[PDB]
Amino acid sequence: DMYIERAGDITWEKDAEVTGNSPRLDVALDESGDFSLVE
Amino acid sequence: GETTDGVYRVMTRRLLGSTQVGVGVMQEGVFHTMWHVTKGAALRSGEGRLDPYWGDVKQDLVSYCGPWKLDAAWDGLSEVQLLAVPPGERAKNIQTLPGIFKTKDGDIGAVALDYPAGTSGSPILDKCGRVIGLYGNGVVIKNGSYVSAITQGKRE
Ligand SMILES: C[C@@H](N)c1ccc(NC(=O)c2cc(Cl)cc(NC(=O)OCc3ccccc3)c2)cc1
Numbered sequence: 001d002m003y004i005e006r007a008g009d010i011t012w013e014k015d016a017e018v019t020g021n022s023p024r025l026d027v028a029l030d031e032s033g034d035f036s037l038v039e
Numbered sequence: 040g041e042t043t044d045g046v047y048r049v050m051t052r053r054l055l056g057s058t059q060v061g062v063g064v065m066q067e068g069v070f071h072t073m074w075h076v077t078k079g080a081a082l083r084s085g086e087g088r089l090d091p092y093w094g095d096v097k098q099d100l101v102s103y104c105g106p107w108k109l110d111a112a113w114d115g116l117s118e119v120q121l122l123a124v125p126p127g128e129r130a131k132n133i134q135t136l137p138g139i140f141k142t143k144d145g146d147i148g149a150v151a152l153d154y155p156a157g158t159s160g161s162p163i164l165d166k167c168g169r170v171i172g173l174y175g176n177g178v179v180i181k182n183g184s185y186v187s188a189i190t191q192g193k194r195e
Contacts, residue, residue, distance in 0.1 A: 007130045
C-alpha cells in the first residue's frame with residue numbers, strides 16, 4: 001500500500017543554488033518508456 | 040485526505056521500514072507522478088483513497104482523481120529549478136540551464152542533476168513557479184552521471 005506525505009509548496013526561490021551543465025544528446029525512446037543513447 | 044496543492048513524497052511499507060519510491064505534484068485536485076513510481080497502483084492520502092485516472096507507460100506518466108492538469112512548457116532559453124525532494128531529506132530548489140534530448144520525433148529539454156532514484160517525480164519549474172515537467176526518466180552518460188528528460192503530459 002503506497003501513501004503520500006506533503007513535502008512543500010511549489011514556488012521559484014530567488015538566489016537558489018545554481019549548478020548543472022546543459023548537454024546536447026542524441027537519444028531514442030522505446031515502447032517501454034526507456035531512453036537510450038544513440039551514437 | 041490532503042488535497043492542498045504542493046509537492047508530495049510517495050512512500051511504501053512493503054519493503055524494510057518506510058521507503059520513499061518517488062515524488063508527485065498535487066494541482067487542481069489531481070495527483071501527478073511518473074508511471075515507474077507507482078506502476079499505476081492506488082494511493083492512500085491519510086484515510087482517503089486516490090484512484091488512477093489516466094496513464095501511459097511510454098510517456099512514463101500517470102494522474103490520479105482526474106485528467107492531467109500540467110501544461111506549461113520550457114521556453115528553450117531560460118534557466119529552470121528542480122524542486123528536488125530526495126528520500127529522508129528536505130525539499131530543495133536547484134537552478135540549472137537545461138540541455139537537449141534530440142530524438143527522431145523532436146527535441147525535449149533535459150536536466151543534468153544527480154539524485155537518488157526515489158527522487159523520481161520531482162517537479163521542474165519555470166520563473167513563474169509553473170510546473171513544466173517531472174524529473175526522473177532519462178539516461179546514464181559516459182561519466183556515470185544521470186541526465187533526465189523534462190517529462191511533460193498533455194492537458195485535454
Ligand atoms: C520503467 C522505466 N520507464 C524507468 C524506470 C526507472 C527510471 N528511473 C531511474 O531508475 C532513475 C531515476 C533517477 Cl531520478 C535517478 C536514477 N539514478 C541512476 O541511474 O543513477 C546512476 C548513477 C551512477 C553513478 C553515479 C550517479 C548516478 C535512476 C526511468 C525509467
